[PDB]
Each structure stands twice: as structure tokens, then as C-alpha cells.
Subunit: 160 residues, 8 copies
């Protein structure tokens, strides 16, 4: 019941995107916590969260942010845990500012970055699942089943 | 010892970039294999490689490619293992084509994407290490040491 | 009556674009088949389709995909037949991810790429027609008539 | 023997790129002509070239140009033959201007567009070859051999 | 009463943009003609128009086109007259394909290019006016008055 | 003879580009002046230059600048003369910043924009020439000769 | 009561963006003036404003402009005062033309540039406040309180 | 004398760019410190630096970084002082990633952003100087002299 994945996001407005990560973790029965933390506006909240993540038993952090998106990278700055980053789509620049701000991390501080938007959120949860599955046979079985079902459920011909 | 990470790249011309992933894993004493696999030129080789990766004992796959860079996403299409993607800098579009073709994967098929170029390659190895560290206390401590040395070694002022 | 062109697409959502290719082939009386196949989500379905296309009598493949668009390129990986690729417009990046993922193929594995969206679908069908017309006089006549009609039907002055 | 493919390019400065199409066609023993034709500097030369291509026995035209790169689309405007387009890498915008001016052709006037640069040129020749192969069993077998050698020749591991 | 400016455009859909050029010329009492001509779809219509523009008494050509926009550049290919180009905004790429296709002309064949969209159309008409004003004192006076009025009519403080 | 075209540029570093405009005007025997004027570093110099250009007898102004490139638009803000703009290629953004800051002028204040770099500079001179040619039969014939020599001199085939 | 910050903007249409700067200055009790001034369309109005800003007691200028945005840079050309620039979002290019036109100033003429749109306007006011706070203890206290309140008011968990 | 400006940069590789800020401040005799601070590699060093800057007597902070470039925004997150940001030109994306990650800061946390590269660094120092000049008449006069010399020193014509 203790959380092994932490989903953090810069704002309430990010939740429409990051909820897709929450739903997938819940679907695969992965205990997790979901929080709002801003690198730019609550930096000390972020420092506290990220420094203590490992000792709190977290295994993977999923961080979503838009614009000058610094939350995933600064989370990675303070934790040794794998951090996955989700670029939240921005109004003007359609998430390109989000993407480059997250993916272009300097050598030495990784953020595993996923697609702009909801797809990216879903994939960050799936990527966290596959990480956790390495050591968790029951979850690995659940994940296999999920992937196989996705593949089997793709239609064979279009509907007009 | 048997490899627990696979580094695969689209061609020999990717090696100047992907060697940084190789060097990093070796530094942290993570057993790994380093291979050329082309999604487009050797599709069956990729299918076989990715489908059998888990049974062979691999835990993480690091895939690098330039241009349209199908390799990391197609690898992730065939394995349940976490796949990390390194966009290799191409002549014309500077790795922006590679970045988009790797990071914009559909929901259901994650690639954890790192920066364009040598830094991304290094970070892919470090991200793989942080994943393995979750289950390997000795590696986790070596990783902690690596990160501590990085932080401690940054100079306080620039040299002329 | 046997299909000589295969239209494949990553998803039902791609059909609003790819239907324009279907309609044009039907208009020019080119027997064809229309299928949903995903490189990223049904890779084995794609391998089967692409490996057997030639022996099934197909002459040209039209492949439509959006995002990290790998369907046309991976189709080309497994068939010797000409593959034409249609970038499906994406939400955030307006089909630029689709375009670069499709057109920037490595030397040795061509995909003939058309415009983003419906225009591209129409043109992929027309391009397939012109390919088939090389050996098919009746189709060549139909194609000439079609092109000439298009040109004659362009208005000479704007309506307010 | 009489040419069945025309390679045309906007200027001498395109030759460093377009020679790769020339070399490929020669390797596969496809009779062809190689010419400089500028849409903007020699418009009548282009009109004549493209209008008469089919009657002269050409089956496919490969057109390369940089900058605004009007040549491939304007060629396609005047011939019913398949036209394949190679964006040549320009100094300032790295072939992105060429790519867009070639690939974004309106519905009705296809250009099958290949990658920016030397790889695109090579692939334009290979795509032309796969088109001709549909009606020429001996070439089809030579093309099969070429593709098989490409696949078989990719190394298994990188060299240092 | 004979036209001294020719406004040409690729399609009826371009008219919503190019009508702004028509209105401004009419406002400044510059006799002009307004036509639909497509470089890609009516190339022979374009050749005829452009080759004969000068002998028909035209002084300036304003050409509007979107997408793989070749109309202004090909018009310039066939006339010695100044050609001004207006990038029509495109759906997916917001007129960036239009812009680069028009402005990036090779040395030797100028197109004076204006802003994407309606502003560009207005400015192409104003630019044509300033060209014609060089030799036409009455028009020069009308143009001065127009510019001065624009400047005087800019408000001094915002309305809430 | 008194200058009828002014070439102005943002700084000495623009000269490598803008000399091509100078050389072209000289070739066509168009009297002109060539100056450095910075919108941002010498704003009063620009105001004076542009406000007095017409009274001094200038007919066309060619303005080149890199980076934010305020020079051509601000020149057009102060003169009623046609202003032609040359985006100079900057180190970082390759003249894309210059292109946008020149071409996206508001309705009311035209800059006729040419390609990025040396070709744009050449074409700015040629466009200025075609403007002057409307009122100068001897120049019009020299321009016709120039254009005819350009067309006639393009080789028919590439040299190795 | 005398203004110490001047907010200027190119047009009424810019006010929906720049009003956010006005509101924040008023909130922090910073006396200011708010005007419409266009670099491109009222250059002499701008020269007058900018040359006299310092002697009128202004300390900071906030300038908002869209498109070929020259207002902030030309303001900086004529004043020694710090000029902050706000890129107003544009229709086609989503404020990217605005951004590059403002931020890419030549060495020697700074404009401190803020985010595209309303956020940028708010931040230009906050940046001006922090500048003024250096010498104004009461404002510094007000600013601290404002920042602290922002940070304390960020929610801790998302609402569904 | 005690520093009143801090120049901080992400790494030694930024120094080639950021030295231009250092040189400028020295030229204007503005006491300053010049340091390496990495948001991602030395997050605690940055927190300490930025939180204590004001109490240490700093008035302005100039921060430069390349790639994802978290340094300027995270610095601004922890200090109430004005923070000026210099995007450093990166190999792959030419400083466009840095520009977006610096300039697109959320409302509430300003970074005054300057041009990409050496010119931006110079301008960051000049902007800092214009801020300090508001309270320091002797510096204000030195700055006036600097700006006057810049304007007066621009040549009237280019040298060959
Ligand atoms: N896209 C792709 C598929 N297989 C290899 N590539 C990429 O093609 C680029 C050029 O490879 P080569 O030098 O062999 O042509 C490399 O970046 C490599 O990843
Ligand atoms: N756009 C165009 C029209 N005719 C030739 N070009 C292109 O202009 C570029 C520069 O050619 P040149 O070196 O002759 O100036 C080349 O890439 C060539 O395709
Ligand atoms: N934007 C601008 C204003 N005045 C000159 N520039 C431009 O600044 C760039 C660099 O100039 P410099 O080498 O003098 O720093 C040049 O392209 C020049 O047009
Ligand atoms: N993003 C970032 C965080 N800390 C330093 N960097 C940046 O990483 C780039 C490469 O630094 P290095 O050469 O040390 O790898 C530099 O531009 C530096 O600002």
C-alpha cells in the first residue's frame, strides 16, 4: 500500500495531462502518490520532496511540467531515483518549450522524457511499470497482459 | 558476467555518440553488450533482438539512432523491457528529426528519451544504472558515489 | 479485381486522412485493399503484411501514420515494393513529427513521402496511379484525363 | 541504351548530392540521363524537358534542388510520369526550406519526396529502381540482391 | 484604365487573403487586374501570363500562394517585371511552408516577399504603389496622404 | 553620377553578404551609395537617412541586417520609398531570426524581403534594378541582357 | 504619484496582453503610465517618448509588441534606461516572430525579454518591481510579501 | 570592493560566452563576482547562492547556461533580485533549447532574457549596468559615455 511511484506536476492545469499517468498506475495496481510541486514557484517544496523520495520508499518519479519546464530536471538533481519527464502542452508553442526544457538535460543528470501531452503521461506510467516489473513478477504478468491486449485490440480495417 | 543492459545503435556512424553510454556503464561496472542493429536495414535482426532480450537476461535497452531513427521505438514495440532512446545528431536537422521520431511515441509504447547527442548517450547509461540500482545495493552505492563526485567536482569559478 | 495497391494506416483516427487515398484509387478504378496496421503497436502484423505484399500481387504500398510515424519506413524495411508515405497531421506539432519520422529515411530504405494531411493522401494515390500507369495503358489514359480535367477546372478569376 | 530515368538538378552545386542517385542507378544498371535544369533560371528548358519526358521513353524523373527548390514540383506539374524529389541541403536553413517546398505539393500534383541530402538522393534512385522493378524481372532480382546485401552487410558490433 | 498591377493567386481559397491587396490598390486608384493562376496546377496558364505581362503594360506583379508556393517564383522566372510574393497561411504549418517556398529564391530570380497572410497582401499592394509612385506624382501624393493618415490615426492610450 | 539606390547594412560584419548587392548594381551600371547604418546603435543616423532619401534622389533602398534585424523595417517606417530587405545569416539561428523580423512587417509598412544571405543580397539589387527598369529603357535592356545571359549560361549537365 | 515605469505597446490589440503588466504594477503600488506607441507605424512618436523618458523621471520601460516586433529594441536605442520586452503572441507564428524580433538584440543595445503573452507581461512588471525594489524598501517589502504569497498559495494535490 | 553583480554559469564551457559579460562589467568598473553554478549538477550550491545573494549585497544576477539551461530560472526562483538570463549556444540546437527554457518562465518568476550567445552576455552586463545606473550617478554617466561611444564609433561605410 506504500507508494512506489510518485507523480508530481507543476500545477492544477497540468492535471488534465497527468491524470492519465495516475489512471494507468491504478489500472496496473501500482501504489503511488500524486502531488503538485513547482520547480519555479515552490523550489523548496521540490527540494524536500526530491531529497527524501528514496528514503520514503519511492522507486520511480514521474514529473509533468509545461513551458520553461524545470520540475523533472530539478527533481533529478536531488534524487538518485529514475525520473521520467512529461512535457505538458503549452498554448503558444504547443509544448515545444516544455519538451526542450525537459529532454535537453546536461550529461550527468538524466530525465527519461516521453511524448508531449496525454500520450506521454500514459507512457511515463507504462515506463515506470516496466521498471518496477523487473523485480515484481506479478506486476510483470499484469503488464504483459496489458500490452498483449492493446496489440490484440487494434482493429484490422477502418470504419467509414 | 552476462549483460544486463543492451546498447544498440543504427550504424557505425552512431558509435562516436553511443560510446559515451558504453564508457559510462563500464565505469559503473554494469555488464552490458554493445551492438549495431538497424530498424530499417536489419528489421528481422531487431525483431529477434528485442523479442528475446528479457529471456536473455537483459533488464534495460539503450537505443541510439539518427535521422528518422526508428530503432528505439521499434525496439520498444517488441520488448516489455524499459527502452531508453538517444537521438543522434544528424547533419542536416541536428538531431531534431531523431528527437521527434523517438520521443513522440504513441500511448502504449514508451521510449524514455534523453538529450540529443553524447550527453544523451551518457545519460541513457546513467538512467539505466538508476533503474538497476533499485534492486542492486552495491550498484546503488556506486551510483551514489558517481553522482556525489559529479556534484563535488564542479569548479567554483571559471578558468581563463 | 485483385488488389494492386495496399493502403495501410496506423489507426482508425488516420482514416479521415487516408480515405482520400482510397477514394482517388476507386475513382481511377485501381483495385486496392485498405487496412489498419501499426508499426509501433502491431509490429508482427506489419512484418507479416510487408513480407508478403509482393507475393500477394501488390505493386505499391501507401502507408499513413502520425506522430512518431514508423509504419511507412518499417513497411519499406520488409518489402522491395515502392512504399509511399503520408504524414498524418498531429495535434501538438501539426504533423511535423509525422513528416520528419517518415521522410528522413536512411540511405538504402526509401519512402516516397507526400504532403501532411489529406492532400498528401490524395497525392500518394495519384503517385501510385502514375507508377501503375507506366505498364497500364487504360489507366494511363484515365490518369491523363483526370489531370487534364483538374487543370481545365481551375477558375480564372476570384469570387467575392 | 536509351535512358529510362532522368536525374535533373537545379545547379552544379547540387551535384555533390545528386551524384549519389547517379551512382546508384549505374550500380543497378539502370540506363539514365543526368542533367542540370533550373525551374527559376531555365523555366522553358524545364517545361520542354518535363512535357516531352514520357514520349522520350523516360519512366521516372528524379529532381533535386536546394533553397526554395521549385524544380521537382514544377517538373511534376508538366509530366504525367512519377517525379521523385530530393531536398538539397542549403547553407542557411539546412534543407528545411527545400523539404517543405517539395513535399507540401497540392492535391493533384505529387512529388514523392526523399530525405534531405545524399541519403535522399540515393533513396530516390532506389525508389525509381523499385518502380521499374515492377515490370522488369531482371532488375527486380538485381534490386533484391542489392537489398539483401545491404541487410547482410550491416556489422553486428561497432568498431573502435 | 489599363491595368498596371496584376494580382494573381493560386486559388479561390487564396482570395480571402489577396482581396486585401485588391482593396488597397483600388483605394489608391491604381488600375489593376485580379486573376487565379496556379504554378503547380495551371503551369501553361502561368507561362502565358508571365511571358506577356510586360508587353501588356503591367508594371508590377503581386502573386499570392500557399503551401509549396511556386507561383511567385515561377512568375518571376518568366518576367523581367518586379514580382512581389504573398505567403498565404497554410492549415498545418501556419504559412511557414508558404514563406520559405517564396522567399528563398536562388540568386538571379528575385521575389520581394511580404508577411504571411492579410498583412502581407496589404503590404504587397503598398509596395507596388510605392514603386509606381516613383514615376507618378499624383499617386505619390495619394500614397503620402495614406501613410500620414495611418500614422496620425494610431491611438495614444489603450481602451479597457 | 548621383546615387539612385542606397545599400545600407547594420554593421561591417554584414558586408560579406551585402557586397553581392553592391557588385550587382555596379555590373548593371546603377549609380548607388553603400553605407553602414544601425537601427539600434545609430537610430538618429537611420531616421535622417531614411527621411531624406527621396529628396536626395534615391529611388530604392536595400537594407541588410542580422539577428533581430530592425534596420529594414525601421528604414521603411521613415521613407515612402520602396525598401528591400536582406536577412543576413547569423551564427546561432542561421538568419531565421532576421527573416522573421524583416518579413513579418505590419500592414502599412512594407519591406520587400529576399532570401537569407548572399543570394538575397544579389536579388535585392536585381529587384531594385527591375523597379528602376520600369522608367529607364536603357537599364531595362541591360537587365534583359543580364537575365538572358543567366538563363543561357546554365550548363546542360553537371561536371565531375 | 509621478510615473516611474512606462508601459508602451504597439497597438490596442496588444492591450489584452499588456493589461496584465498594468494590473501588477497597480497591485504593487508602482506609479506608472500606459501608452500606445508603434516603432513601425509611429516612429517619431517613439523617438520622442524614448529620448525623453529619463528626464521625465521614468526608471524602467516595459514594451510590448507582436510580429516584426521593433518597439522594445528601438526604445532601447534611444534611452539609457532598462527596457523590458514582452513578445505579444501572433496569429500564424504563435509569437515566435515576436520573440526573435525582440530578444535577438545586437551587442550594445539590451532588451530584457520575457515570455510570450500574458505571463511575459506579468513578469515584465515583476522584473521592473524587483529593479525598483533595489532602492525602495517599502516596495521591496511589498514584493517579498507578494512572492511569498504566490509560493504559499500553490496547492499540494490535484483536484479531479 | 564588494560585488554588486553576480555572473554565474552552468559550466566552464559557458565561459567563452559569459566572459563577455565579465569584460563589460569590468570596463564600466562595476564590482562583481564570476562563478560556476549548475542548477542540475550543484542544486544546493545554487539554492545557497541565490537565497543569500541579496543579503550579501548583490543587486543583479546574470546567469548563463546551454541546453535545457535550468540555471537562470531556478536562480530567479530563490532570489528576489532581478535575474538576467543568457542562453548559451549549444551544439545541436544552437541555443534555441536554452532560449525557450529561459524566456518562457511562468508568471511570478521573471528572467530578463538576452540574445543567444556572446552578444546576449555582453547585453546582460549592459542591462545590469543600466539597472545600477538608476541609483549611481557616476555609473550612469559612465554608461552614457559607453553608449555614446558605441553610437559615434559605427563607421559610415564598409571597408573592403
Ligand atoms: N535511421 C537509421 C536506421 N538505421 C540506421 N539509421 C541511422 O542512419 C544514420 C546514418 O547512418 P549511415 O551512416 O549508416 O548512413 C545513423 O544516425 C543511423 O542511426
Ligand atoms: N532553387 C533553385 C532553382 N534553380 C536552382 N536552384 C537551387 O539554388 C541552389 C544554389 O544554386 P547556385 O549555387 O547555382 O546559386 C541549389 O541548391 C539549386 O538547386
Ligand atoms: N541587429 C543589428 C542592428 N545593428 C546591427 N545589427 C546586426 O548585428 C549583427 C552583428 O553585428 P556586429 O558584428 O557589429 O555585432 C549584424 O548582422 C548586424 O546587421
Ligand atoms: N544545462 C546545464 C546545467 N548545468 C550546466 N549546464 C549546461 O550544460 C552545457 C554543457 O556543459 P558541459 O560542457 O559541462 O557538459 C553548458 O552549456 C552548461 O550551461
Amino acid at each position: 500500500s506504500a507508494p512506489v511511484v510518485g507523480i508530481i506536476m507543476g500545477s492544477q492545469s497540468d492535471w488534465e495531462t497527468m491524470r492519465h499517468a495516475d489512471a494507468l498506475l491504478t489500472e496496473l495496481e501500482i501504489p503511488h502518490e500524486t502531488l503538485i510541486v513547482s520547480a519555479n514557484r515552490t523550489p523548496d517544496r521540490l527540494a524536500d520532496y526530491a531529497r527524501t523520495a528514496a528514503e520514503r520508499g519511492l522507486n520511480v518519479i514521474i514529473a509533468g511540467a509545461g513551458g520553461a519546464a524545470h520540475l523533472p530536471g530539478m527533481c533529478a538533481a536531488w534524487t538518485r531515483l529514475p525520473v521520467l519527464g512529461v512535457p505538458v502542452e503549452s498554448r503558444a508553442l504547443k509544448g515545444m518549450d516544455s519538451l526542450l526544457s525537459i529532454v535537453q538535460m546536461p550529461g550527468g543528470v538524466p530525465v527519461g522524457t516521453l511524448a508531449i501531452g496525454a500520450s506521454g503521461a500514459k507512457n511515463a506510467a507504462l515506463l515506470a511499470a516496466s521498471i518496477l516489473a523487473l523485480y515484481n513478477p506479478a506486476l510483470a504478468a499484469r503488464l504483459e497482459t496489458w500490452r498483449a491486449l492493446q496489440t490484440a485490440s487494434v482493429p484490422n480495417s477502418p470504419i467509414t
